[PDB]
Subunit: 114 residues, 3 copies
């Protein structure tokens, strides 16, 4: 799986250990080994949410499977909770797009997962 | 909806108010209230279009609904016009990918829209 | 087509010719003229892959057609080869998401390709 967060919060507000915390919590949440989890945090972005540039985040979670109605509600609580606690971003200023990828459409190490 | 523009134009060339204009014009175009529109502008990128590093932009518009053949033509005329007039990017150096998101796959405010 | 690479490798380690090399190699691989290939390289990113911060890349390739099981397996070899040789990234620290775009969902030059 791959989790990306884009935010206007400054880099200095991203706590040391945040990427590891995302890696471990997503491993627990998705049930996938942490070795398959990639995380990407992009601070200091020029963004607006609802026309306001108060702290916000635009995120995506891509996974081969483990995406679905109930699971995505659970991921959203987890991820909004982390963004609120660690980056001080209000959950109503977070969007997370979820993507269930077909294995044939995910390349890794000179092949795909199909 | 979420609109992202990545461009090699420098940050100082992005006019004051551009994120507000995008918010307002996309609210009008999509018919969604501006409170639901998020915008993300990423200048100073290392990009090429057709092998040329002249000004260009790579964009995406994600929305729950309001995506389709005729609508996307209209969005493209609007957005290429704005990138040309505001950022001085030729419309034939712009790509915009459009994504119709299922509500179950969009997280917000500790939940999803499903 | 559009190819995006996000990486934690520093900007100074990205060769000046890399976007042009990607453009030409992707034109040959996809069979599309280079004028329609766009490339975007984002260095210096805060990322982890499998919980560690050694060089890695998260990439995407979007194309109207020329996407599929066998083609994607081939693209992964090309793109891992380029990222390994030019950016010194191990191929098992590369993910590439592939997207077969509908022409109606790709805007360009004030319209879409539909
Ligand atoms: C960090 C990374 C990239 C995560 C993917 C990965 C790996 C090392 C070994 C394997 C990995 O994912 C694929 C796994 C595998 C491959 C093909 C398949 O059909 C099923 C799998 O579970 C083996 O390191
Ligand atoms: Cl996965
Ligand atoms: Cl592991
Ligand atoms: Cl589910
Ligand atoms: Cl897919
Ligand atoms: Cl929406
Ligand atoms: Cl339509
Ligand atoms: Cl969807
Ligand atoms: Cl294309
Ligand atoms: Cl494209
Ligand atoms: Cl280049
Ligand atoms: Cl194929
Ligand atoms: Cl599509
Ligand atoms: Na996408």
């Amino acid at each position: 799986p791959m989790f990306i967060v884009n935010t206007n919060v400054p880099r200095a507000s991203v706590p040391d250990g945040f990427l590891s915390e995302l890696t471990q919590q997503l491993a627990q949440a998705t049930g996938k080994p942490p070795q398959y989890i990639a995380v990407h945090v992009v601070p200091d972005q020029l963004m607006a949410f609802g026309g306001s540039s108060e702290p916000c985040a635009l995120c995506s979670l891509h996974s081969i499977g483990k995406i679905g109605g109930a699971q995505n509600r659970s991921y959203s609580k987890l991820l909004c909770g982390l963004l609120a606690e660690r980056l001080r971003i209000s959950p109503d200023r977070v969007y997370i797009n979820y993507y269930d990828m077909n294995a044939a459409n995910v390349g890794w190490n000179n092949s795909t997962f199909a």
